[PDB]
Design a protein around this ligand. Structure first.
Ligand code: CLA
Ligand code: CLA
Ligand code: CLA
Ligand code: CLA
Ligand code: CLA
Ligand code: CLA
Ligand SMILES: CCCCCCCCCCCCCCCC(=O)OC[C@H](COP(=O)(O)OC[C@@H](O)CO)OC(=O)CCCCCCCCCCCCCCC
Ligand SMILES: CCCCCCCCCCCCCCCC(=O)OC[C@H](COP(=O)(O)OC[C@@H](O)CO)OC(=O)CCCCCCCCCCCCCCC
Ligand SMILES: CCCCCCCCCCCCCCCCCC(=O)OC[C@H](COP(=O)(O)O)OC(=O)CCCCCCCCCCCCCCCCC
Ligand SMILES: CC1=C(/C=C/C(C)=C/C=CC(\C)=C/C=C/C=C(C)/C=C/C=C(C)/C=C/C2=C(C)CCCC2(C)C)C(C)(C)CCC1
Ligand SMILES: CC1=C(C/C=C(\C)CCC[C@H](C)CCC[C@H](C)CCCC(C)C)C(=O)c2ccccc2C1=O
Ligand code: SF4
Ligand code: SF4
Lengths: 75, 165, 64, 41, 74, 80, 143
C-alpha cells in the first residue's frame, strides 16, 4: 500500500574476485570445466537469471542493471 | 622459362596489364585538385601499384599466356632455375613457424597436465608459463628431433585407449 | 587377509568395453564380501556420462 | 589486482588479446612491406 | 556461411563424437591431449549453431545484393 | 515390444526404475552387488523406447540396455 | 500374500470443464485406463491433457487413453501432493486389469517375491555374434 521508493544499501561488493573465476553464478557450472560443454554452457546460461536465483527480487535487480548496461551500449 | 613461361620482365602482357591498371587510376585522378586528400590518396595508390609491378619484374617471376605471375612447387625444378623463393623457402618458413606454435602448445599441455587441477589451467592460462614456453618453442626442430631420437615424443599404443574393434 | 589391490594405489584398466581401457585410476576401496566387481576405481578424467568412478573385478585391474 | 590479472589471463580475454596482437603485427608488416608475393631474400 | 550452416542442420551429434574420438587418439599418441575434454556440441547447441549460421548467411546475402543493386543504379 | 535387458554390472541404484515413465523396470532381490538388489524388466510389453532408463544408469558400460524392435500400438505411443 | 483392489465404478470424478484432449475412438475399440486416488483436500491439479481440474475430498476417479498419461498424473500426485493412486486397465468388453502398483509396493523398492524377467547374467559384449545367429528370427541379445 502506497507507492514509494525502497532500496537496500550496498547489497553487492564491487570486487574483481568473481571475474577471476568463470561460472560463479550457476551451481552446476561450478567445479571446473571437465569438458568443453562447460565452456559452452558458461555463455548459454549467462543471462538466464532465473536459473541463477529463485528470488524474484534478485532477478528484478539484475534485469534493472542489465537494462542500464544496454542503454550505455546504445549511447 | 621453366615450362613455356617467359619471365614477367619480358612478357608484353604483363607490361600491358601494368599500363591498363595505372591508366584506370589516372582516369580516377582526373576529377580532383591534385592537392586534395582524395588526390593524394590516388597518387599514393598509383605509386604503390607502380612499385609492385616493378618489384615483381625485378624478382623474375614467370608470367603465362596472360600477364599474371606463376609459381613453381617442385624442389630441384625450381632450385636449378632460380625460383626457390616461390614455394620451397616459404615452405621452410611456414613449417618452422607452425612447428613453433604447435610445440609451444604441446609443451604447455604437458607442463600443466602434472598439476593440481589440469582442467583449470586450460581455461585460465598461466601467462608467465605460457610465455616462457612460447620463448622455448623457437628451437623446436632441435628439441623435437631430440625427443624422436629419444623415443619420448610419442606414446606406445598399448597405453592409448582404443575402441572395441 | 585383504584381497586385490591396496587402497590408494594406481591400476591399469583392462576391460575392453570401458571408457578408461588401458588408462590409470586410483583404488578408493575394495569390497571383501564376494561381489563380482568389488574394486572401486577413481579417475581424474570423466567419461561421456560425466562420471569418474567405476567398479571393476580383480582379473581386469592390473596394478601399477 | 591479483584477481584483475587473473581475469586478464582468462581464455576469453587472453585469446582476444593475442589475436589482436598478431593481427596488429601482420597489419604492420603488410603496411611496411606490402605486396610481397615471394620470399625474396 | 549459409551453406556452412547445413553442416550443423543435417548432421547429428554421434558422428561427430566418434570422429572427435579418432582425433583425440591422434593427439594422445603425441602426448598433446587436452585435460579439458573435447566434446561434440550438444544436440540443442548443434541446432542453435545451424539456425544462427543459416539466418546469418541468408540475411547477409540479401543485404549485400540489395545494397550493391541500389548503389549501382537508382 | 522393445527388448529390455539388465546385465550383471548392475549395482542396484534404482535410478533406471524411477526414470522409466511407463513402469517397465522393477527392483528385485539379488546378491551380486552391495545393495543386494537388481533391476528386472517384466512388463516389457509397455516399453516405449524412450531410453530414459538407459540415460540414467551410472554404470560403465550401461547395465540396462534397450533394443527397439517390433512396433505395436503400445510401443508406438499412439493416442489416436 | 497380496490382493489387488477392486475397481469401484461409482466414484466421483474431478471437477473438470471439458477438454479436447480426452478419449478418442481408440478407447472404444482397443482399451483405456483408469486412475483412482484419495484426496485429503479439494485442490487444483494439472490434468495431463491440458487444462486444470479440481480433485475432490475422498475418492477420485479419472479415465485416460494411454497408460503413460496415467503414470505421469500419478508422478505429479506423488511429488506435489504425496497422494498414492491405483491404475487399472479397462477393456471395452468389461474385463479389468490392475496395473501400476502391481505388488502394492512401488517399483523402486524391493518386494522380495517378484519375477526377475529379462535379466541376463552376462555383460554387454558377452552376447553372441550376428554371423553365428544368422537366419535366426531373433537378435543377439536374446540368446
Ligand atoms: C613430391 C612429388 C614430386 C614429384 C611428382 C616430382 C617430380 C619431378 N622431379 Mg622432384 N623432388 C621432390 C618431389 C617430387 N618431384 C622432392 C621432395 C625433392 C627434394 C628431395 C625433389 C628434388 C628434385 C630434384 C633435385 C630434381 C627433381 C626433378 C623432378 C622432375 C624429373 C623426374 C624424373 O626425371 O624422373 C623421375 C625419377 C624417379 C626415380 C621417380 C620431375 C617432374 C629433377 C628436375 O628438376 O628436372 C628438371 C631434378 O633434378 N626433383
Ligand atoms: C597446441 C595445441 C595443438 C597441437 C599441438 C595439435 C596438434 C595436432 N593436431 Mg590439433 N587441434 C587443436 C590443437 C592442437 N593440435 C585445437 C585447439 C583444436 C580444436 C579446433 C584442434 C583440432 C584438430 C583436428 C580436427 C585435427 C587436429 C589434428 C592434429 C594433428 C595434425 C597436425 C595439424 O595440422 O593439426 C591441425 C591444427 C588445427 C586444425 C587447429 C590448430 C589450433 C591452434 C592453431 C593451435 C592451438 C594453440 C594454443 C591455443 C596456444 C597455446 C600456447 C600456450 C603458450 C598457451 C597434430 C598432431 C588432425 C589429426 O587428426 O591428426 C592427424 C585433425 O584432424 N587437431
Ligand atoms: C568442441 C569445442 C572445443 C572448445 C570450446 C575448445 C576450447 C579450448 N581448447 Mg580445445 N580441442 C577440441 C575442441 C574444443 N576446444 C578438439 C576437438 C580437440 C582435438 C582433440 C582439441 C584439442 C585441444 C588442444 C591440444 C588444446 C586445446 C586447447 C583449448 C583451450 C584454448 C583456449 C586458449 O587458451 O586461448 C588461447 C591461448 C593463447 C593464444 C596463448 C597466448 C600466448 C601468449 C604467451 C599469451 C580452450 C578453452 C589448448 C589449451 O590447453 O589451452 C591452453 C590446447 O593446447 N584443445
Ligand atoms: C548489451 C550486451 C550485454 C550486457 C548489457 C551484458 C550485461 C551483463 N553481463 Mg553479459 N554477455 C554478453 C553481453 C552483455 N552482457 C555477451 C554477448 C556474452 C557472450 C558470451 C556475455 C557473457 C556474459 C557472461 C559469461 C557473464 C556475463 C555477465 C553479465 C552481468 C555482469 C556485468 C558486469 O558486471 O561486468 C561489468 C562491465 C563493465 C565494467 C563495463 C566494461 C565491460 C568489460 C569489463 C570490458 C573488459 C574488457 C577489457 C577492455 C579487456 C578486453 C579487451 C582486449 C582483449 C583487447 C551484466 C548484467 C556475468 C554475470 O553476472 O552473469 C549473470 C557473467 O558471468 N555476460
Ligand atoms: C592458405 C591460404 C593463404 C595463403 C597461403 C596466403 C598467402 C599470402 N597472402 Mg593471403 N588471404 C587469404 C589466404 C591466404 N593467403 C585469405 C583467406 C584472405 C581473405 C582475408 C587473404 C587475403 C589477403 C590479402 C588482402 C593480402 C594477402 C596477402 C598474402 C601474401 C602476404 C605475404 C605476407 O603477409 O608477407 C609476409 C609476412 C611475414 C613474413 C610475417 C611472418 C611472421 C608471422 C607474423 C608469424 C605468425 C605466427 C602466428 C601471401 C603470399 C597480401 C598480398 O599482398 O598478397 C601478395 C595481401 O595484400 N592475403
Ligand atoms: C565461415 C565464417 C563464420 C562466421 C561468419 C561465423 C559466425 C558465427 N558463428 Mg561460427 N564457426 C565457423 C565459422 C563461422 N562462424 C567455423 C568454421 C566453425 C567450426 C566448424 C564454427 C563453429 C561455431 C560454433 C560451435 C558456434 C559458432 C557460432 C557463431 C555465431 C556466434 C557469433 C560469434 O561468433 O561471436 C563473436 C565472435 C567473436 C567475439 C570473435 C571470435 C574469435 C574466434 C574464437 C577466433 C556467429 C553468427 C556460435 C553460435 O552458433 O551461436 C549459437 C557457436 O556456438 N560457430
Ligand atoms: C642447393 C643449391 C641450388 C642453388 C642453385 C643456384 C642457381 C640459381 C639459384 C638462385 O636463384 O639463386 C639463389 C636462390 C634465389 O635467388 P633468386 O634468383 O631468387 O634471387 C632473386 C630474388 O630472390 C631477389 O630479388 O636462393 C635460394 O633459394 C637457394 C636455396 C637455398 C635454400 C636455403 C634454405 C632451404 C631450406
Ligand atoms: C542474423 C543474425 C543471426 C542470429 C540468429 C539467432 C538464432 C539463434 C537463436 C538461438 C538462441 C540462442 C540463445 C540461447 C542459447 C541456447 O539455448 O542454445 C543452445 C546451446 C546450448 O544449450 P543446451 O541445451 O546445451 O543447454 C544446457 C545447459 O543450459 C546446461 O548446462 O547454446 C548455444 O547455442 C551455445 C552458445 C554459444 C554462443 C556464445 C559463443 C560466443 C558468441 C558471443 C556473442 C556474440 C556477439 C553477440 C552480438 C553482439
Ligand atoms: C580501470 C580498472 C583497473 C583496476 C585495477 C585493479 C583493481 C583491483 C582493485 O581495485 O581492488 C578491488 C578493491 C579492493 O581491493 P582487493 O581487496 O585487493 O580486491 O575494491 C575496491 O575497494 C574498489 C573496487 C573498484 C576498483 C576500481 C574500478 C574502476 C574505477 C574506475 C571506474 C571507470
Ligand atoms: C619438400 C617439398 C614438398 C614435399 C614433398 C614430399 C613427398 C613430402 C613428404 C613427406 C612424408 C611422406 C612425410 C611423412 C611423415 C611421417 C610422420 C610420422 C610425420 C610427422 C610429424 C609429427 C610426429 C609431428 C610432431 C609434432 C611436432 C614435431 C611439432 C608440433 C607438435 C607435434 C607433436 C605435432 C613439395 C614438393 C610438396 C613442395 C615443396 C616442398
Ligand atoms: C561440425 C559439427 C560438430 C563439431 C563441432 C565442433 C567440435 C565445434 C567446433 C568449434 C571449434 C573448436 C572452434 C572453431 C573456432 C571458429 C573459427 C569460430 C568459433 C566461433 C565462436 C565465437 C563460437 C558437432 O559437434 C555437431 C553436433 C550436433 C550436430 C551437428 C554438429 C556438427 O555439424
Ligand atoms: S540404473 Fe543401471 S545399475 Fe542402476 S539399478 Fe538400473 S540397471 Fe542397475
Ligand atoms: S526404454 Fe523407456 S519405457 Fe522402455 S524400459 Fe527404458 S525407460 Fe522404460
Amino acid at each position: 500500500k502506497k507507492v514509494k521508493i525502497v532500496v537496500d544499501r550496498n547489497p553487492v561488493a564491487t570486487n574483481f574476485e568473481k571475474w577471476a573465476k568463470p561460472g560463479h553464478f550457476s551451481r552446476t557450472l561450478s567445479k571446473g570445466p571437465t569438458t568443453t560443454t562447460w565452456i559452452w554452457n558458461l555463455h548459454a546460461d549467462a543471462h538466464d537469471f532465473d536459473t541463477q536465483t529463485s528470488d524474484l527480487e534478485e532477478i528484478s535487480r539484475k534485469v534493472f542493471s542489465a537494462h542500464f548496461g544496454q542503454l550505455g551500449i546504445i549511447f | 622459362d621453366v615450362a613455356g613461361l617467359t619471365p614477367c620482365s619480358e612478357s608484353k602482357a604483363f607490361a600491358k596489364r601494368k599500363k591498363n591498371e595505372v591508366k584506370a587510376l589516372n582516369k580516377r585522378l582526373k576529377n580532383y585538385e591534385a592537392d586534395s586528400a582524395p588526390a593524394l590518396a590516388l597518387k599514393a595508390t598509383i605509386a604503390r601499384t607502380e612499385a609492385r609491378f616493378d618489384k615483381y619484374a625485378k624478382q623474375g617471376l614467370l608470367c603465362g599466356t596472360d600477364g599474371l605471375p606463376h609459381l613453381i612447387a617442385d624442389p630441384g625444378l625450381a632450385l636449378r632455375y632460380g625460383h626457390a623463393g616461390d614455394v620451397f623457402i616459404p615452405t621452410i618458413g611456414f613449417i618452422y613457424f607452425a612447428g613453433w606454435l604447435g610445440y609451444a602448445g604441446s609443451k604447455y599441455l604437458q607442463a600443466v597436465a602434472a598439476t593440481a587441477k589440469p582442467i583449470e589451467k586450460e581455461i585460465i592460462i598461466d601467462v608467465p608459463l605460457a610465455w616462457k614456453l612460447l620463448w622455448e618453442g623457437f628451437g623446436w626442430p632441435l628439441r623435437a628431433f631430440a625427443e624422436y631420437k629419444n623415443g619420448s615424443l610419442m606414446e606406445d599404443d598399448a597405453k592409448i585407449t582404443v575402441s572395441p574393434r | 587377509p585383504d584381497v586385490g589391490p591396496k587402497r590408494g594405489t594406481q591400476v591399469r584398466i583392462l576391460r575392453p568395453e570401458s571408457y578408461w581401457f588401458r588408462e590409470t585410476g586410483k583404488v578408493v576401496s575394495v569390497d571383501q564380501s564376494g561381489i563380482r566387481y568389488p574394486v572401486v576405481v577413481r579417475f581424474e578424467k570423466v567419461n561421456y556420462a560425466g562420471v569418474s568412478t567405476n567398479n571393476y573385478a580383480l582379473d581386469e585391474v592390473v596394478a601399477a | 589486482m591479483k584477481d584483475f590479472t587473473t581475469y586478464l589471463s582468462t581464455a576469453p580475454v587472453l585469446t582476444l588479446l593475442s589475436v589482436t596482437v598478431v593481427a596488429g603485427l601482420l597489419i604492420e608488416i603488410n603496411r611496411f612491406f606490402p605486396d610481397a608475393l615471394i620470399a625474396a631474400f | 556461411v549459409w551453406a556452412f550452416s547445413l553442416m550443423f542442420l543435417f548432421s547429428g551429434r554421434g558422428y561427430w563424437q566418434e570422429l572427435i574420438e579418432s582425433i583425440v587418439w591422434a593427439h594422445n599418441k603425441l602426448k598433446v591431449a587436452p585435460a579439458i575434454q573435447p566434446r561434440a556440441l550438444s544436440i540443442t547447441q548443434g541446432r542453435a549453431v545451424g539456425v544462427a549460421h543459416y539466418l546469418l548467411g541468408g540475411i547477409a546475402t540479401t543485404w549485400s545484393f540489395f545494397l550493391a543493386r541500389i548503389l549501382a543504379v537508382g | 515390444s522393445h527388448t529390455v535387458k539388465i546385465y550383471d554390472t548392475c549395482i542396484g541404484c534404482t535410478q533406471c526404475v524411477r526414470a522409466c515413465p511407463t513402469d517397465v523396470l522393477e527392483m528385485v532381490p539379488w546378491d551380486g552387488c552391495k545393495a543386494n538388489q537388481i533391476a528386472s524388466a517384466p512388463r516389457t510389453e509397455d516399453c516405449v523406447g524412450c531410453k530414459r532408463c538407459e540415460s540414467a544408469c551410472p554404470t560403465d558400460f550401461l547395465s540396462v540396455r534397450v533394443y527397439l524392435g517390433s512396433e505395436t500400438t503400445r510401443s508406438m505411443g499412439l493416442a489416436y | 500374500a497380496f490382493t489387488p483392489p477392486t475397481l469401484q465404478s461409482d466414484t466421483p470424478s474431478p471437477i473438470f470443464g471439458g477438454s479436447t484432449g480426452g478419449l478418442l475412438s481408440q478407447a472404444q475399440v482397443e482399451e483405456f485406463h483408469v486412475i483412482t486416488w484419495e484426496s485429503k483436500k479439494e485442490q487444483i491439479f494439472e490434468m495431463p491433457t491440458g487444462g486444470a481440474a479440481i480433485m475432490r475430498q475422498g475418492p477420485n476417479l479419472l479415465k485416460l487413453a494411454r497408460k503413460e498419461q496415467c503414470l505421469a498424473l500419478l508422478t505429479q500426485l506423488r511429488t506435489k501432493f504425496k497422494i498414492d493412486g491405483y491404475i487399472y486397465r479397462v477393456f471395452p468388453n468389461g474385463e479389468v486389469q490392475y496395473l501400476h502398483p502391481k505388488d502394492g509396493v512401488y517399483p523402486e523398492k524391493v518386494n522380495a517375491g517378484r519375477s526377475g524377467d529379462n535379466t541376463n547374467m552376462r555383460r554387454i559384449g558377452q552376447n553372441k555374434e550376428p554371423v553365428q545367429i544368422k537366419f535366426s528370427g531373433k537378435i543377439p541379445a536374446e540368446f
